[PDB]
Amino acid sequence: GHEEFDIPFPSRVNPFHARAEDRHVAWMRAMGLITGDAAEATYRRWSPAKVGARWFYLAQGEDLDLGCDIFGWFFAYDDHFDGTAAFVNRTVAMLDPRADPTGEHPLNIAFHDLWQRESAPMSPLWQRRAVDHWTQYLTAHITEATNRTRSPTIADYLELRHRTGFMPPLLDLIERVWRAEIPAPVYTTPEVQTLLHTTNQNINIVNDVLSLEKEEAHGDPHNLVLVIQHERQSTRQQALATARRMIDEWTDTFIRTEPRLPALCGRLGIPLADRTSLYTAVEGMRAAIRGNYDWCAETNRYVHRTPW
Amino acid sequence: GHEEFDIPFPSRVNPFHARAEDRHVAWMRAMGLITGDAAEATYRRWSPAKVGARWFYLAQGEDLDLGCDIFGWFFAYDDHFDGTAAFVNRTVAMLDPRADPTGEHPLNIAFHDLWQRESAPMSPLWQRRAVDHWTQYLTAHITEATNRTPTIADYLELRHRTGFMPPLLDLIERVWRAEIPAPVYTTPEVQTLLHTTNQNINIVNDVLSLEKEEAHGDPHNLVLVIQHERQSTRQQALATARRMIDEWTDTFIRTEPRLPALCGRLGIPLADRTSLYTAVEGMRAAIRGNYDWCAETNRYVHRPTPW
Ligand SMILES: CC(C)=CCC/C(C)=C(\F)COP(=O)(O)OP(=O)(O)O
Ligand SMILES: CC(C)=CCC/C(C)=C(\F)COP(=O)(O)OP(=O)(O)O
Ligand SMILES: CC[N+](C)(C)CCCS(=O)(=O)[O-]
Ligand SMILES: CC[N+](C)(C)CCCS(=O)(=O)[O-]
Ligand SMILES: CCC(CO)(CO)CO
Ligand SMILES: CCC(CO)(CO)CO
Ligand SMILES: [Mg+2]
Ligand SMILES: [Mg+2]
Ligand SMILES: [Mg+2]
Ligand SMILES: [Mg+2]
Ligand SMILES: [Mg+2]
Ligand SMILES: [Mg+2]
């Protein structure tokens, strides 16, 4: 019923996914992002906590709750801008260690809650890059908003998705939910940067393919398939085939790069215990690539082939 | 306080490990393999269901119980021969669908139960190779008994052609409910993954169970075999085992990336490929779970009995 991709990791879901949905819905209601039974029932039809349950298939308790809550908040925040600077600047302001969320919009109170939970156990090294990545994702909403008012090239679109999209924050989140911070000496290596970049783009473009009908029905031009078609004057099948080749190349690059990590850690003198943190984050990336694919394929959010 | 190896997969334990131990101990008692509270308390100190819980970190219910029970039965069966043809031939006889376990030794009644549960949902093709692998593991106990009553090369051959890993590799497919597609099972790539999983786990266990086996006088350990053959020191032989472990790990992770393109060349449908990828994940979990469990278990006290 949907485009199928060869993602070479098993399908996995956290065993506590069902209870996780109940807890996540209760959070969305407590934060004022879901109001009323009708909206809750519509929201649950998306399996909205199941994307976190697939990414974070062994997390428990508050770690699992955080992972699930991030995605639900994203749907509410993302869909808010399908409908600015003052608003987004308030979201960014919630990253400040001394931020006071009192009186802010519910989306920004919820973000403050997420960030406090996400950042508290992580190092200053992680927090610096996590603040940068959050800021880039949040402030980007102004670039999508201008495209809509005043279509990008293939190259520009790809740059905007991977430099300023939601994957840079989600990659940082993997380290938090798995409680596995990537050692700073290996984080900046070409190998780990390639793994981060390929995870980012694979997930972006798998989502573009599998959410295409929804975005077309809404008139959202921000989709690689539509961008390719406009730039190249190509058919729908041609552009889908181009996206497919790109997805396959990123998957291949990921799985060809991972085997280099143990020897790289040896050259950098990384203690074995710290290597296991890296290997755990890389497993989190595998689970993210596969979980994104399985969730985008199954979710009613993408019916086109509102709870707010 | 143990030899450490760089196994490039995360440490994972099934969330239901605690309850799985209770269910597994109850099975061992129901089968007559653990008798009395003292024996149970000694057995639990080994974390005996935790090896299944690490290998099968997402299994639930009866799949998890089977995974855990196999390892517990192995300890009981293995330790039985630290204490033969008539006996092992009865175990082998329990593989036949027509077998009647009534009146057999508790170890063979328990094996019959394991095999019924293990084989019931699997294809006839899987069952044929699983019967072969079980038969080779079981009948080998006669060669370990003969040696008690080998070269490095002979030892490695005996440990990987007729040891406990060939049955455990088949078990991965059962517990994960992911049979390796027939056209890819025989490829050099998949055979290399199976072989490297087999040898890595065997030799990581040899290194980490060395002190136990030395204390019992058991010669069946690569470190001891190397020392005898080469007249080398303990550190030399441990360093040799270390290099071998590292080489097998490297071969495993260098080989896995070949699988998607191989499946493409063989025309394997995508759903069947995911079965292969699941079994390979099971191999990763087995390599790492073996390491983490051998490193933590009281069974290996002798660094730096319930029957
Ligand atoms: C949320 C998921 C599944 C993954 C995280 C990274 C991606 C690809 C998105 F957020 C979805 O992108 P987009 O802005 O196109 O959102 P929708 O496709 O849900 O409309
Ligand atoms: C490690 C386990 C339990 C299973 C995986 C396969 C291996 C290496 C064994 F069964 C241990 O063999 P061995 O005959 O050396 O058994 P023990 O080391 O437990 O005495
Ligand atoms: C194994 C049973 N326990 C650990 C209580 C399950 C808890 C899962 S949770 O915290 O996500 O509800
Ligand atoms: C997620 C909660 N449930 C499904 C009851 C866990 C049962 C796991 S089991 O069967 O291994 O005890
Ligand atoms: C819809 C299938 C296809 C175009 O025909 C795109 O993935 C195949 O290349
Ligand atoms: C005991 C450590 C060592 C020997 O000194 C064996 O692994 C290091 O090569
Ligand atoms: Mg968006
Ligand atoms: Mg969107
Ligand atoms: Mg989309
Ligand atoms: Mg043995
Ligand atoms: Mg033994
Ligand atoms: Mg041993």
From Swiss-Prot, chain A:
<feature type="short sequence motif" description="NXXXSXXXE motif">
    <location>
        <begin position="207"/>
        <end position="215"/>
    </location>
</feature>
<dbReference type="Pfam" id="PF19086">
    <property type="entry name" value="Terpene_syn_C_2"/>
</dbReference>
<dbReference type="InterPro" id="IPR034686">
    <property type="entry name" value="Terpene_cyclase-like_2"/>
</dbReference>
<dbReference type="InterPro" id="IPR008949">
    <property type="entry name" value="Isoprenoid_synthase_dom_sf"/>
</dbReference>
<feature type="binding site">
    <location>
        <position position="161"/>
    </location>
    <ligand>
        <name>substrate</name>
    </ligand>
</feature>
<dbReference type="GO" id="GO:0033383">
    <property type="term" value="P:geranyl diphosphate metabolic process"/>
</dbReference>
<feature type="short sequence motif" description="DDXXD motif">
    <location>
        <begin position="78"/>
        <end position="82"/>
    </location>
</feature>
<feature type="binding site">
    <location>
        <position position="78"/>
    </location>
    <ligand>
        <name>Mg(2+) 1</name>
    </ligand>
</feature>
<dbReference type="GO" id="GO:0010333">
    <property type="term" value="F:terpene synthase activity"/>
</dbReference>
<keyword id="KW-0479">Metal-binding</keyword>
<feature type="binding site">
    <location>
        <position position="215"/>
    </location>
    <ligand>
        <name>Mg(2+) 3</name>
    </ligand>
</feature>
<feature type="binding site">
    <location>
        <position position="214"/>
    </location>
    <ligand>
        <name>substrate</name>
    </ligand>
</feature>
<keyword id="KW-0460">Magnesium</keyword>
<dbReference type="GO" id="GO:0102313">
    <property type="term" value="F:1,8-cineole synthase activity"/>
</dbReference>
<comment type="subunit">
    <text>Homodimer.</text>
</comment>
<feature type="binding site">
    <location>
        <position position="211"/>
    </location>
    <ligand>
        <name>Mg(2+) 3</name>
    </ligand>
</feature>
<keyword id="KW-0614">Plasmid</keyword>
<comment type="function">
    <text>In vitro, catalyzes the formation of 1,8-cineole from geranyl diphosphate (GPP). Can also accept neryl diphosphate (NPP) as substrate to produce 1,8-cineole.</text>
</comment>
<feature type="binding site">
    <location>
        <begin position="301"/>
        <end position="302"/>
    </location>
    <ligand>
        <name>substrate</name>
    </ligand>
</feature>
<dbReference type="GO" id="GO:0000287">
    <property type="term" value="F:magnesium ion binding"/>
</dbReference>
<feature type="binding site">
    <location>
        <position position="78"/>
    </location>
    <ligand>
        <name>Mg(2+) 2</name>
    </ligand>
</feature>
<comment type="similarity">
    <text>Belongs to the terpene synthase family.</text>
</comment>
<feature type="binding site">
    <location>
        <position position="207"/>
    </location>
    <ligand>
        <name>Mg(2+) 3</name>
    </ligand>
</feature>
<protein>
    <recommendedName>
        <fullName>1,8-cineole synthase</fullName>
        <ecNumber>4.2.3.108</ecNumber>
    </recommendedName>
</protein>
<keyword id="KW-0456">Lyase</keyword>
